Amino acid sequence: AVGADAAYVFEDPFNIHDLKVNVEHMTEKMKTDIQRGLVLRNEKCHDYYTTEFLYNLYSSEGKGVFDCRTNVLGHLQQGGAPTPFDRNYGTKLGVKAMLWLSEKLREVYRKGRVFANAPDSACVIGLKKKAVAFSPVTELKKDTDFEHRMPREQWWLSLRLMLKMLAQ
Amino acid sequence: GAGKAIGVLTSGGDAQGMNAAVRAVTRMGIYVGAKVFLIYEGYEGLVEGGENIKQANWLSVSNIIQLGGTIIGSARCKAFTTREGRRAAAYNLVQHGITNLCVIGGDGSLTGANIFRSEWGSLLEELVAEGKISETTARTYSHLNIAGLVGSIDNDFCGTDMTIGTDSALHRIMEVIDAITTTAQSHQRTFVLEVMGRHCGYLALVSALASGADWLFIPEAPPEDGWENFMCERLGETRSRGSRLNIIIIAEGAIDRNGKPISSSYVKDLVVQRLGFDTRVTVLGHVQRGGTPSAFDRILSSKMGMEAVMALLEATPDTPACVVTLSGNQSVRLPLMECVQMTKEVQKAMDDKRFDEATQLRGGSFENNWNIYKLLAHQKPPKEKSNFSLAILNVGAPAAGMNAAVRSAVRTGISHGHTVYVVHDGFEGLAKGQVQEVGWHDVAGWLGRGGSMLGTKRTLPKGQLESIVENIRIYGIHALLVVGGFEAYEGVLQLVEARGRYEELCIVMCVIPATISNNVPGTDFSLGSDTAVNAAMESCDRIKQSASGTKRRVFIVETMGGYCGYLATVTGIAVGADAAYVFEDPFNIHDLKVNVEHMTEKMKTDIQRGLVLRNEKCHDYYTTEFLYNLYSSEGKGVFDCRTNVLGHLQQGGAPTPFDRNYGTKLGVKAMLWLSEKLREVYRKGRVFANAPDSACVIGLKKKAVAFSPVTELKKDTDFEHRMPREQWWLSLRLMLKMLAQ
Amino acid sequence: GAGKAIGVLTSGGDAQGMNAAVRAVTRMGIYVGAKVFLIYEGYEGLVEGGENIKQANWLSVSNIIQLGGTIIGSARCKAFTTREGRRAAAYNLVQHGITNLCVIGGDGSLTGANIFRSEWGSLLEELVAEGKISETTARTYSHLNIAGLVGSIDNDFCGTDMTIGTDSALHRIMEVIDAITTTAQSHQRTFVLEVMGRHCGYLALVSALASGADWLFIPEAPPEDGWENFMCERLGETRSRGSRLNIIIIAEGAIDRNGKPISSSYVKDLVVQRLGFDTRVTVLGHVQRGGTPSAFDRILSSKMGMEAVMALLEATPDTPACVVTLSGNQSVRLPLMECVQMTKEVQKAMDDKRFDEATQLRGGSFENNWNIYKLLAHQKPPKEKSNFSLAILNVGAPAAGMNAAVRSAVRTGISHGHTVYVVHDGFEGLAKGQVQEVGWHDVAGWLGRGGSMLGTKRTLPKGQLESIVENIRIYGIHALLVVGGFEAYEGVLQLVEARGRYEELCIVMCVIPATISNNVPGTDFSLGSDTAVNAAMESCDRIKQSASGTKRRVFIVETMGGYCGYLATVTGIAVGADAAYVFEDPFNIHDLKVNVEHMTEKMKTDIQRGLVLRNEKCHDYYTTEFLYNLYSSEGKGVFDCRTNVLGHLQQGGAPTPFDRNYGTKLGVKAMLWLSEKLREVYRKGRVFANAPDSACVIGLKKKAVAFSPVTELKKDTDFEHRMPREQWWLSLRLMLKMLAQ
Ligand SMILES: Nc1ncnc2c1ncn2[C@@H]1O[C@H](COP(=O)(O)OP(=O)(O)O)[C@@H](O)[C@H]1O
Ligand SMILES: Nc1ncnc2c1ncn2[C@@H]1O[C@H](COP(=O)(O)OP(=O)(O)O)[C@@H](O)[C@H]1O
Ligand SMILES: Nc1ncnc2c1ncn2[C@@H]1O[C@H](COP(=O)(O)OP(=O)(O)O)[C@@H](O)[C@H]1O
Ligand SMILES: Nc1ncnc2c1ncn2[C@@H]1O[C@H](COP(=O)(O)OP(=O)(O)O)[C@@H](O)[C@H]1O
Ligand SMILES: Nc1ncnc2c1ncn2[C@@H]1O[C@H](COP(=O)(O)OP(=O)(O)O)[C@@H](O)[C@H]1O
């Protein structure tokens, strides 16, 4: 969204050679009229190559050509008021989850008491590729990384090719 | 660069430092492309051959640099003196195709080595005659090239300022003497300490000078007739005038005027009979021949082993056999028979009761130390009583040796009849007053202490110059002796540059460089650097032991020294570090990658460890945490990484024997120069020092002492990074990088 | 809590550690509110009086804890044996109003002290009769209370497990022996080392056991008839079967069966005549009586000096005179004449040729060490040849002592006829195979090495348990001896808890605790802690020297040890640190303010320095950088602050004498227990260990050795912080805080 020259991410492992390759591209870009740069770093993309590491590397190997600074977008990223999409998306999910909840709740009522024991009674409402789906919470367990707290396969890894293409 | 073989052996009395020499000879010979053979048990295995000779790789001499003695034995041989044994030795070398030989040992082993060279051709002719070898082999290996290394604690060999292993022998001696002084002072006991040194008094003189001994017996200066009365007078004077203990050093070859040996038992019986003092006698024995080698011995043994390999590969049959030695503070190369003959001539002159001729043959440095020792041992009653007044300052960070230099300068000045003051806390004190007059006994026992008794500060004088000028005039101070680091040089320079504005600063000044970092211009060694290298070497040795226990580990160790990379460089040589990152050698990210891949390659071998040193200010960005993260990341799965920061442990505890003697000598010599200039600039009833020659830095140059003016050094100084432009020790980095794979 | 006086003196042969005792006696006596008087030159100044007695403040005993000998002299006196001298001594104490007296010294000085007490009343009566003092003064000071401290390197006093100064004497001896071994091994020479110990063989036995000496002469076990042949057989066997050198220890009071002294010169002449080996003789002499005190001596001297002050202030005239001693590992208190008489009875039994009675009177620990030494010196031919098979592992971080314990266990097992294996890199190795059988000579020379020769890892077994079970079954291993830290205890616990799922883990297991941090449950001391405390003490002493040179400075020093604050606590006691921040003593910001203001107050005095220790994990937030910023800010203008991080230097270099012997003893005893259980659980042709009693931790409890089951310790262990619930050493923190102002 901001035309960043690089975005370092856990899902795309990077070593010191990749950082050199990005630094020399930044040196080449500094010869042109657009004498600036911006690289993003996820807060836990690398165990060792932290943001201070990248600062020192970029400052050293780009000495004389450019200088370097660091920013840490803290809890500003949680945002102020929600966007129009978040308002509508939250409203729709609240209605649809409640409808599904009422349907299951009258389904599992028998002999004067509620009794939900099947795995289908504990679900995650979510917008899949096409439309809404209610995946059981236990069925998702085989597609979840509880160490890193994220799913195995993520749909948005295709966007990284566009990111790297739009940057020289 | 080579297609030939090298042989190496140790012979004679072992000395701690031989292992570093064998390592350096082996690794340089392998680097140059030559085959290296380790010859065990000295000449005995040279004659015997077979399993005693075996080819060595880069790992054969690994993990030995910190060990005393020698790993290849050095037994004594009798058959090699005979021609039958020498032809057998030549046959063994020919069977293994060895045409060069390195011998580490004293005068006798080197004499046998050259006799072996001098008839190598005839031995091959005899071997061909009996049919042991063919004619082609004799023609191929027709010559033998010899390079000699002098390993001995005695330090009698004439062509060498320091034999391999004598500094560490002094370390063992001073460890013993430092132990004795506590109980001796506690019980008020005299002690007679018998030191080794076959027919030489170097060890006894240096140890007596470093320990403040009350009397010394050396064969080079035997005591005069009726010396017993003079001994009793001195020892009675010391123990009467506040000296709680007395120490008597006696070499194992000491003699009288008639050449007859003086026994330590005699000295004990004399002091008991004629003074009644409770006394004891200790023979230090073979403790001197063992222990870990000191830092200087490792560095020197590495330099000499490298140079010996260069000599063996660049020699020709017309070239005479050579030894590699010290002259000044560089690795010179001399011919073997000249040095052997000069040592024998010294011994013969000393045996013929020509003690003056023997003294003049060895060199005048021994006589100067002998006179310095006698000057500082006891108080000769002064008679000059000049009107001159002095102050002595400590400035900069504390260094091990400041107390020795202050004691030497104070007592020399009291001997010259001056009123001596000492300033507490440096220029800051002199601004705040804090000046007191000092006597002979007020500085007793300071020789063995590290740190600073007066106190030291980094404060510079220009901010408090009005108060400094006031106190200079109140106490009538006519000269300053500022012993310290770069801040001392800066302060004396500021006082000189302010002479026009202030007349009282028209005053003689001398700077004794004393700092661990070795950054003061005008000298090769700053007082306190040897103690710091030894402390860092000990710490890094413990770290290597920790790393070798936890296999597949690398350590990043941070050394002090500011922008000066001396302390990291010589430390890394002394502990076999794989790299030492230094301001004077700029390094980028590519060099760090290159070092990481070498560490990965080394982790495939049997030596699965690593150690890289980093000066505390070698790089603006690539700090120690940066190197940690880089090494941990790119070496993931192969090894892990840890960091250590050697903080103010590098200032060391007690000073080494070298720092004690070096500080003592600089204090005497600076005071002599100070008195000479002070009586020179006295005219019409007042002192008036305005020329730039009156403000100087005493320092040991390449050869000997020199007094460089403080303003003349300004054009060779970096006041941004606080160090000189050109430094003599940048050559050692090539040896450091060579000894590491 | 007091309104009375204390007197203190040192007498007899000095020992390094007396200075710490004098400091602790003085500072505790001042803390309790009593006046303290330093009595110089021992009983000589007690009789002489006058200037020899002077009142002491908190700074009189400052900057002495790291010094050997004694600062108050300890001369010998002859007049005090007479009643005229004793009444003069009593008169001097009465003139200064001293009614309590602390005496530091051996049996003779304490005997004279009690004779002085036993007639104090009659001496006062005589002084009143001659008119020296008035009746009111005699009635006020009518009694004398005595507390004794045993300062001696010999360690002959019966009521004390360790006399003040014997551990440091062992440090001096091992420094000497470590020096000798390099040249001895280099030249293949026998050595005869004469150690002190007046009529006692403690020093010789411990040093021989720590150095792997090939023969020992002690008076408590004189050699049998015709011992010369047996000596020649052993020394010929060693030097024949790969032992390059031989070491012979000989106490200075050694004797034959007829009580006749055996001279070291005789031993030399015997080995020359009957074996022809090149040999030498060294008399270590008074080196043992001096040098810096080791860490244990400082800690012990501080504890005993505190306890002596408590005894003097809580005693009553009916109470007999007492000494403060060691029993187990606590500060007990015994009556003086009982211990004096028992020591004399031992000496008389040894003089009357009742060597068995003298041995049984001293204690069985000496005999056990004597048998352990003879077992491990040479290989007795085994005959059992059991089918049992063993493996030995190193786990955790490397510690100084692991190599000693492995050598002891391997050779004991080979003596018992077992097939012994060693695992390289711990449980990780055992998973990866890496098992090799080991022989007697395969472990020679390991006693003197730090770190780990086998290699150690933090890996735990449950992740590779299938591979571990496979290798256990392939090599037929029937027992494990896992020497290591908390990770070893955890691993053996995991193997025990997995016995139900895997049958091959039904196997006997023993854990030797070996780690610097002293965090393994089931023992008071872990193998390697003494070396680490000594290394940290040396480093902090150098730091204090740096701080005292740069006046008005405070240091924050970070120690290793995880969450266990043992290493920081005992280090801080050993170097007089003003504070030691520890996990077990929670501290908030108010405590840091309180310490900063005390440091500000201390900076007004003559001792303008400071030192606070911080365990590496004492606080989640208040890290070392936090303390740096706080101390620098709130102490701005008064002092500056610096930080040091003692990294893996605290793992130490070579092990101390204690770690060598302690590792050797634990290896033997663990192996004995292992063989006993292994033959107990053998039934119907197979080993089957399933009870919890078959998996244990060998450890030295309050009194003696115990084998606690690994599962029983689980209810007394903190697996979150990796340390036991209750720790014996939390009492030392009160002494630490008391000795600091
Ligand atoms: N003139 C000589 N000819 C042949 N070999 C010699 C000669 N002198 C000494 N050697 C050899 O040097 C070895 C030891 O030398 P030595 O003089 O005893 O000790 P150091 O090296 O301390 O002088 C001896 O084994 C001997 O074989
Ligand atoms: N501290 C000492 N140790 C060893 N020898 C000494 C010492 N002091 C003096 N000597 C020697 O004893 C002799 C007498 O001392 P000397 O310096 O000549 O006194 P003087 O000033 O009367 O000439 C000299 O030969 C000297 O070299
Ligand atoms: N411990 C050491 N550190 C550095 N250099 C040393 C050391 N020991 C000796 N040297 C060098 O070898 C020389 C030996 O000194 P020496 O001849 O005894 O007295 P002097 O320095 O007065 O000539 C020294 O000048 C020095 O250059
Ligand atoms: N029986 C005694 N009566 C009085 N004083 C004694 C007695 N025994 C020893 N002393 C005093 O103890 C001092 C030294 O004691 P000593 O036995 O010689 O050394 P140590 O403390 O090692 O045993 C002597 O000065 C002596 O005055
Ligand atoms: N390494 C040694 N050092 C000192 N004394 C020893 C040593 N080995 C044995 N002895 C003693 O010499 C004697 C003979 O040795 P011993 O252990 O009895 O052999 P054996 O198994 O034949 O009985 C014994 O009295 C023993 O205590």
Ligand SMILES: Nc1ncnc2c1ncn2[C@@H]1O[C@H](COP(=O)(O)OP(=O)(O)O)[C@@H](O)[C@H]1O
């Ligand atoms: N260096 C030390 N560190 C800690 N404790 C020690 C040290 N030295 C001795 N001790 C303690 O004093 C005792 C002396 O040990 P010792 O009697 O020689 O043999 P053993 O330990 O087998 O009984 C030890 O058990 C120990 O509790």
Ligand SMILES: O=P(O)(O)OC[C@H]1O[C@](O)(COP(=O)(O)O)[C@@H](O)[C@@H]1O
């Ligand atoms: O560089 P100098 O002034 O010669 O002294 C070296 C000392 O100075 C230091 O910077 C220490 O500075 P501080 O004592 O002020 O902390 C170290 O490099 C070293 O301990």
Ligand SMILES: O=P(O)(O)OC[C@H]1O[C@](O)(COP(=O)(O)O)[C@@H](O)[C@@H]1O
């Ligand atoms: O806590 P342990 O396992 O008993 O050993 C103590 C050592 O272990 C350490 O954690 C060091 O760990 P590393 O060697 O892995 O860096 C330190 O607390 C200390 O050096």
Ligand SMILES: O=P(O)(O)OC[C@H]1O[C@](O)(CO)[C@@H](O)[C@@H]1O
């Ligand atoms: O060990 P050895 O053979 O007695 O050697 C003694 C000699 O060693 C030396 O250090 C030189 O070999 C001399 O000081 C001493 O005289």
Ligand SMILES: O=P(O)(O)OC[C@H]1O[C@](O)(CO)[C@@H](O)[C@@H]1O
């Ligand atoms: O210094 P001195 O008086 O010769 O003392 C020797 C004795 O000192 C001791 O250390 C005990 O006083 C004994 O080992 C030795 O016999």
